[PDB]
Amino acid sequence: TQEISYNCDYGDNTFNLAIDIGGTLAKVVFSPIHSNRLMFYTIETEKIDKFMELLHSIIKEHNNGCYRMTHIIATGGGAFKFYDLLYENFPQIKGISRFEEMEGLIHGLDFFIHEIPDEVFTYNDQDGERIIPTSSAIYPYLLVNIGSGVSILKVTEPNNFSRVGGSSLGGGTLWGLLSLITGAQTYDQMLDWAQEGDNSSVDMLVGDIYGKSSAIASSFGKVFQYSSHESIEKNNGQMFKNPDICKSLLFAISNNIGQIAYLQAKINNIQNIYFGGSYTRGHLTTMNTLSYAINFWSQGSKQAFFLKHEGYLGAMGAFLSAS
Amino acid sequence: QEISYNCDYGDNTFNLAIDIGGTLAKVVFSPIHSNRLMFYTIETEKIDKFMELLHSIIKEHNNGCYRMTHIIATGGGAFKFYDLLYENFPQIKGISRFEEMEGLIHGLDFFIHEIPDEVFTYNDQDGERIIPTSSGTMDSKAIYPYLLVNIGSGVSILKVTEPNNFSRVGGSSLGGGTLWGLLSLITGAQTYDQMLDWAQEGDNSSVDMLVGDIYGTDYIGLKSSAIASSFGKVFQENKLYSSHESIEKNNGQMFKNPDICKSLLFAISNNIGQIAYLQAKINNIQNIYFGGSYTRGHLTTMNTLSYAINFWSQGSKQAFFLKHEGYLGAMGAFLSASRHSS
Numbered sequence: 311t312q313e314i315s316y317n318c319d320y321g322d323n324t325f326n327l328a329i330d331i332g333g334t335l336a337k338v339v340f341s342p343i344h345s346n347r348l349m350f351y352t353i354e355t356e357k358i359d360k361f362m363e364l365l366h367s368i369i370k371e372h373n374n375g376c377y378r379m380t381h382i383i384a385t386g387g388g389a390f391k392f393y394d395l396l397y398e399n400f401p402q403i404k405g406i407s408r409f410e411e412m413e414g415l416i417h418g419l420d421f422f423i424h425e426i427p428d429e430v431f432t433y434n435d436q437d438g439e440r441i442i443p444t445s446s447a448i449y450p451y452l453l454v455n456i457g458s459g460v461s462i463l464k465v466t467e468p469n470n471f472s473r474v475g476g477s478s479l480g481g482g483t484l485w486g487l488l489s490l491i492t493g494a495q496t497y498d499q500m501l502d503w504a505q506e507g508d509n510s511s512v513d514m515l516v517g518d519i520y521g522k523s524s525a526i527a528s529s530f531g532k533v534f535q536y537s538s539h540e541s542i543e544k545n546n547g548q549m550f551k552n553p554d555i556c557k558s559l560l561f562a563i564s565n566n567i568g569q570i571a572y573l574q575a576k577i578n579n580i581q582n583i584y585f586g587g588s589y590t591r592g593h594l595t596t597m598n599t600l601s602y603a604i605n606f607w608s609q610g611s612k613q614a615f616f617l618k619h620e621g622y623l624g625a626m627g628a629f630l631s632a633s
Numbered sequence: 634q635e636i637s638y639n640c641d642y643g644d645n646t647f648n649l650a651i652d653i654g655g656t657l658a659k660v661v662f663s664p665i666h667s668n669r670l671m672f673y674t675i676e677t678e679k680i681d682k683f684m685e686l687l688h689s690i691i692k693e694h695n696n697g698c699y700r701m702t703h704i705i706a707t708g709g710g711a712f713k714f715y716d717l718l719y720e721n722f723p724q725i726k727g728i729s730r731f732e733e734m735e736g737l738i739h740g741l742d743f744f745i746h747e748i749p750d751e752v753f754t755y756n757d758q759d760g761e762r763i764i765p766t767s768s769g770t771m772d773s774k775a776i777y778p779y780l781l782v783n784i785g786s787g788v789s790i791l792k793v794t795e796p797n798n799f800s801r802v803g804g805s806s807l808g809g810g811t812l813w814g815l816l817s818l819i820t821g822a823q824t825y826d827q828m829l830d831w832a833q834e835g836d837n838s839s840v841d842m843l844v845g846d847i848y849g850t851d852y853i854g855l856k857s858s859a860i861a862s863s864f865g866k867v868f869q870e871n872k873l874y875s876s877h878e879s880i881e882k883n884n885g886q887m888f889k890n891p892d893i894c895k896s897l898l899f900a901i902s903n904n905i906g907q908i909a910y911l912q913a914k915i916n917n918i919q920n921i922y923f924g925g926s927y928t929r930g931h932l933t934t935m936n937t938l939s940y941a942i943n944f945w946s947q948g949s950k951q952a953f954f955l956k957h958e959g960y961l962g963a964m965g966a967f968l969s970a971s972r973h974s975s
C-alpha cells in the first residue's frame with residue numbers, strides 16, 4: 311500500500327502499531343522491526359470486528375504473528391471507547407498505550423512538515439501542484455482536521471497547541487447527505503459525480519437573485535421552489551441530477567469549512583492553514599475549493615496547504631510516542 | 634401584523650414598500666392618516682398571486698388610488714422584478730428602488746429606536762425577555778456596535794458601528810434555502826412550518842454522531858450530548874436523477890423524517906450561530922441581531938442560535954430576535970419613500 315522510507319528507532323526491539331480510531335475510519339501507522347519503512351492503512355470502524363481482524367492480519371503478516379513483541383498505541387476517540395476492548399481482543403500483546411487525539415495530530419503534522427520530503431503541497435486549478443520544501447516561517451499555523459466533523463487546532467510553537475474551534479459540518483455530513491439523496495455507495499462515486507456536476511440547477515447564484523455571477527447565494531436554494539384534491543405527487547415527483555447535487559453539497563461543505571478556517575486564521579493572526587483528515591483524498595476539485603476559499607477571503611494573504619498523508623496525522627503522532 | 638406609529642403622510646402619497654428576496658416578498662405600508670404600519674409576506678413563486686396582493690392592498694387600503702401610490706422595491710430581487718412591477722402598475726405615481734443593505738439597516742435601526750416590545754432575547758431557561766431599546770432604559774451606546782445576521786435563502790451579515798455607519802462582512806450560502814431545499818427533498822415536508830413541527834418532535838441522535846458516540850464520554854470543552862458530526866451516522870445502473878420518491882423508496886423508513894429535520898435544523902442554525910460569533914469576535918461586537926424569515930418565533934431555533942452565541946463567547950455576546958424580523962428591508966424602503974413624500 312502507501313509506504314515512506316524513514317530510519318525509525320527500533321532500540322526497543324518492538325513492533326509499534328499505531329491506531330487512530332475515529333467515529334467512522336480507523337487509520338494505522340506501523341514499521342516492521344528494522345525495515346526503515348513507515349506503512350499506512352485505512353479501514354471503516356463500524357463492524358469493529360472486521361477492524362480488530364485487520365490488526366490481527368498486520369501482526370500475522372508484518373511481525374511474524376508475534377503479539378509478545380507488538381505494542382499497540384491507540385489515538386482518536388475510540389482510544390477510550392475501545393482501550394479495554396483492545397486488551398480483550400489482544401491478550402498476549404506486549405502492551406497498549408494511549409496518545410491524546412489533538413497531541414497526536416500535531417506531533418504527526420510536525421513530523422511530516424520537518425522530516426518527510428514531497429509531503430506538504432499547495433494545489434489550485436490555475437498553478438496545479440507545488441511541493442513546499444518544509445523538510446529542507448512554519449509557525450504559527452492552523453490545522454483544520456476534516457473527518458466526520460471538523461477540529462481546528464492553533465500551533466504557535468513546536469509543543470504549544472490548543473483546539474480553537476470546530477464544526478459538526480464535516481466529511482460525515484457530506485457523505486451522509488449525498489448517500490441518502492443519491493444512493494451513491496462510495497465517496498469516489500460522489501466525487502466522480504460532483505466532477506461533472508453543474509450546481510447551478512440546485513443552487514441560487516448571485517445572478518439568479520439579481521441579474522461574480524457564478525457566486526453561490528444559497529446552496530440547494532432552488533430545490534424547495536381530509537383528501538379532496540389531486541395527490542401532491544407533482545412535488546414528490548420533482549427530479550434533480552445526482553452530479554449537480556454532488557457538486558452543490560461538495561461546494562457547500564467545502565466553502566463553509568474554508569470560511570470558518572479563514573475566520574479562525576483572522577482571529578489568531580495566522581497565515582498558514584493545513585488541511586488534514588480523510589476529506590480531500592487528493593481530489594483536485596475539493597483541494598481547489600478549499601484553496602480558493604482561503605485565497606478569496608484573504609485576497610491571497612493566507613495560504614491553504616495539503617498533506618500526502620493527511621489521514622495519518624494522528625496515527626503518526628501516536629507511533630512516534632512509542633519512542 | 635400591525636404597529637401603532639404616528640407617520641408623516643406629507644403629500645398623502647401612499648407608499649407601498651416591497652422587499653423581494655429569493656423566495657419571499659415582504660410588504661410594509663400605512664393607509665393615509667391611519668398611524669398604522671401594516672405588514673404582509675407572500676411567496677414570489679406565483680407571480681399572479683404576488684401582483685394580486687399589491688392590487689388588493691391599493692384597493693382596500695388606498696381606496697383604489699393608483700395615481701397616488703408609490704411602490705419602492707428593495708432586496709436582491711428589486712432589479713429582477715422591476716419590469717414585472719412596471720407592466721402590472723402602469724397607472725401608478727411611481728416605482729423606485731432602495732439599496733438592500735441601507736434598507737435593512739434603516740429598517741432595523743428604526744425598529745430598535747422607535748418600536749416597543751420589538752427586540753427580545755429567548756432561551757429555554759430564561760424564556761422571552763423584551764429589551765427596552767426604544768425607551769431610553771437600553772439607550773445611547775449599549776445599542777452600538779451591532780451585527781445584523783439577515784437569514785433568507787442565504788445569510789447576509791452587516792456591521793453597524795454608529796448611526797449611518799454600516800458595512801457588509803462575509804455571509805454564508807448555508808441559509809434557510811439550504812435547510813428548506815434539503816428537508817423538502819429528503820423528507821417530502823410540504824411547508825417550512827411542517828419541517829419545524831417534525832423537527833420539534835425529532836431525535837437528531839439517530840442520524841448525528843455526538844461527542845458521546847465517538848469519545849464514549851465527555852471531552853475539548855464539549856459535553857457528551859454535543860454534536861460532533863451532523864448526519865455522521867447516515868453514511869453507515871448509471872442513474873442520473875433523484876427525487877423524494879426515489880429517496881423514500883430506496884431507504885424506506887431506515888431514517889425517520891422528524892430526526893432528519895431536527896439534525897439539519899441544528900446543523901444550519903449552529904453553523905449560522907458560529908459564523909455570526911466569528912464575525913462579532915473579529916469586529917469586537919457583543920450585540921447580534923437575527924433578521925429575515927428563518928427564526929419565525931420558533932422557540933427551538935431561537936434557543937439554538939442563542940446557545941451557540943452564548944457558548945462560543947463564554948457569555949460575552951448575546952443573540953437578539955425581532956418580532957418583525959422579516960420586514961427590516963421593507964421598513965427601511967418605506968422610511969425612504971416616506972421622507973420623499975414629505
Ligand SMILES: CC(C)(C)c1ccc(CNc2nc3[nH]c(CN4CCOCC4)cc(=O)n3n2)cc1
Pocket residue numbers: 387411458459460461473474475476477478844847848852853854855859860861862
Ligand atoms: C474530536 C472529536 C470528538 C472527534 C470531535 C470532532 C469534531 C467535532 C465537531 N463539532 C463541534 N466542534 C466544536 N467545537 C466547538 C469549539 N469550542 C471551543 C471552546 O471549547 C469548547 C469547544 C464548539 C462546538 O459546538 N463544536 N461542535 C466535535 C468533536
